[PDB]
Each structure stands twice: as C-alpha cells, then as structure tokens.
Amino acid sequence: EVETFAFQAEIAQLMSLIINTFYSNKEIFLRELISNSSDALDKIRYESLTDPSKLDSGKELHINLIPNKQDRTLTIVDTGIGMTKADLINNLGTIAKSGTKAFMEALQAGADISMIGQFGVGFYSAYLVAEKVTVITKHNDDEQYAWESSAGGSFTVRTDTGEPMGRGTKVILHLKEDQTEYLEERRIKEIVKKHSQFIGYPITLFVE
Ligand SMILES: CCCCn1c(Cc2ccc3c(c2)OCO3)nc2c(N)nc(F)nc21
C-alpha cells in the first residue's frame, strides 16, 4: 500500500522554480547529490566510532554512479546512514523550510541556482534533469522505503519489497528526454572531475 503526501507549500514552490527557470548550468545537480552522499557517509562513519555494531549492515563506505540508457536512469548509490520514514514524511520538510526561504530570498539580489547547496536544499536540483526521482533508502533502526516524486506538489512513500540494500540511499534520476547526456561516461567523468574531485570516499562510475 502506497501513501500520498503533499509537500509543504514552500517546497512545492522551490520545485516549481527549479523546473521553470531558464538556466543552462544543469550539470551541478550531480555534485549536490554526491555532496549529500558525502555528508551521509561521514555520519555513519562518526556514529560508528562509539558503537561498532552500526556497520553490521555493511562496512564499505563508497558512492557508485550507475547509468542505464535502456532505463533512462542515473543512479547515485551510497552506503551512508540512510533515511527513516520520519525523515521522508516529516523531518526533511521541516529542515528544508528555512533553506527555501533563504534561497528564494537570495535569488532576487541576483544569486543563482548553482548556489542552492549553500542553503541545505540541493537535493531538489535533481529536478533540473529528472522528470521523476525515486529514492530507495534503508537506515538501521528501520525498514527500507521507496519515496518517489514527479513534483506536482505530492510525493509517495511505500515500503520497498525490492533488492534489500543493507544500509544507504539510492537516488534514481529518471531523466528528462533531452537530459540524456547525463548517461554518457565521458559526461559523468568531466562533471565529477570538475565539481566533485575531492570527495573523501571512493566514487565508482559504472559503465554500460
Ligand atoms: C537534508 C539532508 C539529509 C537528507 N539526505 C539527502 C537530501 C534529501 C533531501 C530531501 C529528500 C531526499 C534527500 O529524498 C527525499 O527527499 N540525501 C541523503 C542521503 N544520500 N543519505 C542520508 F542518510 N540522508 C540524505
């Protein structure tokens, strides 16, 4: 059974802004998702220093980027702390609300979209290149869950009966028809070299 939630109005407004505004530098969506993955891996690495059983769901700390041109998808896979249902439904919405006012306020005054990360809300950049995102995530104290959003001001959560994932988050970007460049290898590599070269954890770019 699928549950359907409305986004806070502010969120739904920022998703509309990112989907409507004309801005060509779409490629920063990647370094936002990787930086998010980086923060998540850093959390589980810290938590584990005082409670070693934390990495029973998996010791390896890495990011994968996985492009599939048959599915039209780019997947940003991490083995970080993951996300609870509470996070999905309630708390990321709660954290983001302040983030969105600030960003929005900075944008007249002439800051830009590439600066979204500075405000705690770069997840939403995905919607620069993805017509839907699906997020698969598993945190230790909790089940694995599938959140999905085509914007539209609603998002779903379900329990995921899919391939169990141990601990972490998969960001499945279902790309817009004209965004397929983000499935080439030479594309993904340049962007990672440019904006993500110093991430303290291995990033393996899969080929097809
Ligand atoms: C806002 C920072 C925390 C949430 N978060 C984010 C940003 C984010 C914000 C809002 C989101 C979302 C993801 O999926 C659904 O809605 N990425 C994460 C990740 N890879 N791993 C963990 F452990 N947490 C993540």
Short mmCIF file of C-alpha atoms and ligand atoms in Angstrom, two decimals:
data_model
loop_
_atom_site.label_atom_id
_atom_site.label_comp_id
_atom_site.label_asym_id
_atom_site.label_seq_id
_atom_site.Cartn_x
_atom_site.Cartn_y
_atom_site.Cartn_z
CA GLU A 1 0.00 0.00 0.00
CA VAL A 2 1.29 3.47 -1.27
CA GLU A 3 0.83 6.62 0.89
CA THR A 4 0.48 10.08 -0.79
CA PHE A 5 1.65 13.16 0.86
CA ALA A 6 1.52 16.75 -0.10
CA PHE A 7 4.86 18.77 0.04
CA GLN A 8 4.90 21.86 2.33
CA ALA A 9 3.96 24.90 0.08
CA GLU A 10 7.44 26.43 0.19
CA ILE A 11 8.98 23.06 -1.13
CA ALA A 12 6.39 22.75 -3.91
CA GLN A 13 7.21 26.40 -4.77
CA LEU A 14 11.00 25.70 -4.90
CA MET A 15 10.49 22.54 -7.01
CA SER A 16 8.43 24.74 -9.48
CA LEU A 17 11.11 27.38 -9.57
CA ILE A 18 13.94 24.88 -10.38
CA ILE A 19 11.65 23.20 -13.07
CA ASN A 20 10.59 26.59 -14.66
CA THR A 21 13.51 28.98 -14.51
CA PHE A 22 15.65 29.09 -17.61
CA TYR A 23 19.14 28.20 -16.58
CA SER A 24 21.57 26.21 -18.68
CA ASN A 25 24.14 25.10 -15.99
CA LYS A 26 22.08 21.95 -15.21
CA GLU A 27 25.21 19.72 -14.57
CA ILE A 28 25.57 20.96 -10.87
CA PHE A 29 22.76 18.56 -9.92
CA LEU A 30 25.47 15.82 -9.53
CA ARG A 31 27.79 17.50 -7.17
CA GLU A 32 24.77 18.20 -4.90
CA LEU A 33 23.75 14.55 -4.73
CA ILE A 34 27.33 13.46 -4.20
CA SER A 35 27.83 16.00 -1.51
CA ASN A 36 24.66 14.78 0.13
CA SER A 37 26.04 11.26 -0.12
CA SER A 38 29.32 12.51 1.37
CA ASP A 39 27.54 14.02 4.37
CA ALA A 40 25.60 10.73 4.95
CA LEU A 41 28.72 8.62 4.82
CA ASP A 42 30.50 10.96 7.27
CA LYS A 43 27.54 10.46 9.67
CA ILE A 44 27.59 6.79 9.71
CA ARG A 45 31.48 6.86 9.99
CA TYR A 46 31.20 9.06 13.10
CA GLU A 47 28.32 7.21 14.72
CA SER A 48 30.35 4.03 14.37
CA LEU A 49 33.31 5.28 16.33
CA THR A 50 31.31 4.94 19.60
CA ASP A 51 29.14 1.92 18.54
CA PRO A 52 30.82 -0.56 16.19
CA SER A 53 27.62 -2.62 15.66
CA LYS A 54 26.44 0.39 13.48
CA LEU A 55 28.40 -1.06 10.49
CA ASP A 56 26.90 -4.55 10.86
CA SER A 57 24.54 -3.53 7.97
CA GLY A 58 27.85 -3.01 5.98
CA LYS A 59 31.39 -1.78 6.45
CA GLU A 60 32.19 -0.42 2.90
CA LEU A 61 31.93 3.49 2.68
CA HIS A 62 31.56 4.45 -1.01
CA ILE A 63 29.44 6.19 -3.74
CA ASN A 64 28.53 4.45 -7.16
CA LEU A 65 27.28 6.32 -10.09
CA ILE A 66 25.22 3.92 -12.29
CA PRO A 67 23.89 4.94 -15.71
CA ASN A 68 21.44 2.78 -17.61
CA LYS A 69 20.42 4.03 -21.08
CA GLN A 70 17.73 1.34 -21.52
CA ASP A 71 16.04 2.55 -18.29
CA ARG A 72 16.85 6.18 -18.96
CA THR A 73 18.20 6.40 -15.40
CA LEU A 74 21.24 7.77 -13.48
CA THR A 75 21.51 6.21 -10.00
CA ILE A 76 23.59 7.71 -7.21
CA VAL A 77 24.14 4.88 -4.80
CA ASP A 78 25.71 5.39 -1.34
CA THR A 79 26.29 3.20 1.78
CA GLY A 80 25.82 6.16 4.30
CA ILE A 81 23.48 6.43 7.29
CA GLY A 82 20.22 6.32 5.17
CA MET A 83 16.93 7.84 5.94
CA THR A 84 14.00 6.91 8.28
CA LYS A 85 10.22 7.21 7.42
CA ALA A 86 10.17 10.14 9.78
CA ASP A 87 12.87 11.79 7.73
CA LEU A 88 10.90 11.10 4.49
CA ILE A 89 7.46 12.29 5.66
CA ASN A 90 8.31 14.84 8.28
CA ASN A 91 11.76 15.92 9.14
CA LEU A 92 13.39 16.72 5.77
CA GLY A 93 10.37 19.00 5.07
CA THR A 94 10.84 20.59 8.39
CA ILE A 95 14.57 21.25 7.75
CA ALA A 96 14.09 22.41 4.24
CA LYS A 97 11.54 25.19 5.02
CA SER A 98 14.14 27.58 6.30
CA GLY A 99 16.59 26.52 3.49
CA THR A 100 13.92 27.51 0.83
CA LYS A 101 13.02 30.92 2.11
CA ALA A 102 16.65 31.84 2.32
CA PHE A 103 17.49 30.54 -1.25
CA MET A 104 14.44 32.23 -2.70
CA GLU A 105 15.33 35.48 -0.95
CA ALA A 106 18.93 35.24 -2.27
CA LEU A 107 17.78 34.69 -5.95
CA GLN A 108 16.44 38.34 -6.47
CA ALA A 109 19.51 40.16 -5.23
CA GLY A 110 21.00 38.11 -8.09
CA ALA A 111 22.48 34.80 -6.60
CA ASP A 112 21.89 31.67 -8.82
CA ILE A 113 20.61 28.20 -8.89
CA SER A 114 24.20 26.68 -8.54
CA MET A 115 24.18 28.17 -5.17
CA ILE A 116 21.26 26.04 -3.85
CA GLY A 117 23.68 23.84 -1.91
CA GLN A 118 24.62 26.74 0.29
CA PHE A 119 21.07 26.59 1.68
CA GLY A 120 20.70 22.95 2.65
CA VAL A 121 18.33 22.11 -0.26
CA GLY A 122 20.41 20.83 -3.17
CA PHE A 123 18.51 17.51 -3.31
CA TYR A 124 15.91 19.44 -5.25
CA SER A 125 18.34 20.27 -8.02
CA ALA A 126 17.84 16.72 -9.36
CA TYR A 127 14.66 18.23 -10.86
CA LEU A 128 16.89 20.36 -13.19
CA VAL A 129 17.49 16.99 -15.15
CA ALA A 130 14.96 14.31 -13.73
CA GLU A 131 11.21 14.26 -14.69
CA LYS A 132 10.76 11.93 -11.64
CA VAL A 133 13.13 10.88 -8.93
CA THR A 134 12.80 7.66 -6.97
CA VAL A 135 14.76 7.43 -3.67
CA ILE A 136 15.44 4.00 -2.11
CA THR A 137 16.75 4.22 1.40
CA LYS A 138 17.45 1.99 4.43
CA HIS A 139 18.58 3.24 7.96
CA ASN A 140 19.44 0.65 10.69
CA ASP A 141 16.70 1.38 13.14
CA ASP A 142 14.00 0.96 10.34
CA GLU A 143 12.72 -0.73 7.20
CA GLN A 144 13.71 0.00 3.61
CA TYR A 145 11.37 2.53 1.89
CA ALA A 146 10.71 3.87 -1.50
CA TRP A 147 9.98 7.66 -1.85
CA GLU A 148 9.06 8.94 -5.39
CA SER A 149 8.16 12.38 -6.74
CA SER A 150 7.34 13.85 -10.13
CA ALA A 151 6.95 17.21 -8.36
CA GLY A 152 3.44 18.18 -8.93
CA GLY A 153 3.36 19.09 -5.12
CA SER A 154 2.88 15.45 -3.95
CA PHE A 155 5.26 12.62 -3.15
CA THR A 156 4.69 8.97 -2.24
CA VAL A 157 6.29 6.72 0.30
CA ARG A 158 5.92 2.92 0.25
CA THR A 159 7.69 0.03 1.93
CA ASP A 160 10.11 -1.45 -0.53
CA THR A 161 9.93 -5.13 -1.22
CA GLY A 162 12.91 -4.61 -3.77
CA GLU A 163 16.50 -5.84 -3.53
CA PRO A 164 17.36 -5.26 0.12
CA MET A 165 20.14 -2.78 0.39
CA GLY A 166 21.93 -3.28 3.81
CA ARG A 167 22.11 0.49 4.74
CA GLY A 168 22.19 3.59 2.50
CA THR A 169 20.22 5.53 -0.16
CA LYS A 170 19.85 5.18 -3.99
CA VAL A 171 18.79 8.30 -5.85
CA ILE A 172 17.20 7.08 -9.12
CA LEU A 173 17.06 10.10 -11.55
CA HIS A 174 14.55 9.28 -14.36
CA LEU A 175 15.87 11.74 -16.80
CA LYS A 176 14.10 14.19 -18.98
CA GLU A 177 14.11 13.27 -22.65
CA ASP A 178 16.55 15.95 -23.53
CA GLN A 179 18.81 15.32 -20.49
CA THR A 180 20.38 12.01 -21.74
CA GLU A 181 23.84 13.41 -21.86
CA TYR A 182 23.98 12.51 -18.18
CA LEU A 183 24.00 8.92 -19.12
CA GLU A 184 27.37 9.11 -21.12
CA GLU A 185 30.51 8.05 -19.45
CA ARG A 186 32.72 10.91 -20.77
CA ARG A 187 29.96 13.33 -19.49
CA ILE A 188 29.83 11.84 -15.97
CA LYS A 189 33.59 11.82 -15.62
CA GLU A 190 34.13 15.53 -16.63
CA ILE A 191 31.43 16.65 -14.20
CA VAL A 192 32.81 14.56 -11.37
CA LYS A 193 36.39 15.81 -12.24
CA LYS A 194 35.13 19.44 -12.23
CA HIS A 195 32.83 19.65 -9.17
CA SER A 196 33.40 16.57 -7.10
CA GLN A 197 37.15 15.68 -7.39
CA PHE A 198 37.92 15.84 -3.58
CA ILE A 199 35.16 13.70 -2.04
CA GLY A 200 36.70 11.78 0.76
CA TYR A 201 35.28 8.25 -0.26
CA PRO A 202 35.58 6.18 -3.44
CA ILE A 203 33.18 7.09 -6.35
CA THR A 204 32.99 4.39 -8.93
CA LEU A 205 31.50 5.35 -12.17
CA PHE A 206 29.93 2.11 -13.71
CA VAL A 207 29.98 1.69 -17.47
CA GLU A 208 27.20 0.06 -19.61
C1 LIG B 1 18.76 17.26 4.07
C2 LIG B 1 19.94 16.38 4.47
C3 LIG B 1 19.59 14.95 4.92
C4 LIG B 1 18.80 14.04 3.97
N1 LIG B 1 19.51 13.39 2.86
C5 LIG B 1 19.62 13.81 1.49
C6 LIG B 1 18.96 15.08 0.82
C7 LIG B 1 17.49 14.79 0.56
C8 LIG B 1 16.57 15.79 0.84
C9 LIG B 1 15.15 15.62 0.66
C10 LIG B 1 14.80 14.37 0.17
C11 LIG B 1 15.70 13.37 -0.08
C12 LIG B 1 17.08 13.52 0.10
O1 LIG B 1 14.96 12.29 -0.53
C13 LIG B 1 13.57 12.51 -0.43
O2 LIG B 1 13.59 13.88 -0.07
N2 LIG B 1 20.42 12.85 0.83
C14 LIG B 1 20.74 11.87 1.70
C15 LIG B 1 21.47 10.71 1.63
N3 LIG B 1 22.03 10.27 0.44
N4 LIG B 1 21.62 9.98 2.81
C16 LIG B 1 21.12 10.26 4.04
F1 LIG B 1 21.40 9.03 5.12
N5 LIG B 1 20.39 11.39 4.07
C17 LIG B 1 20.19 12.20 2.96
#
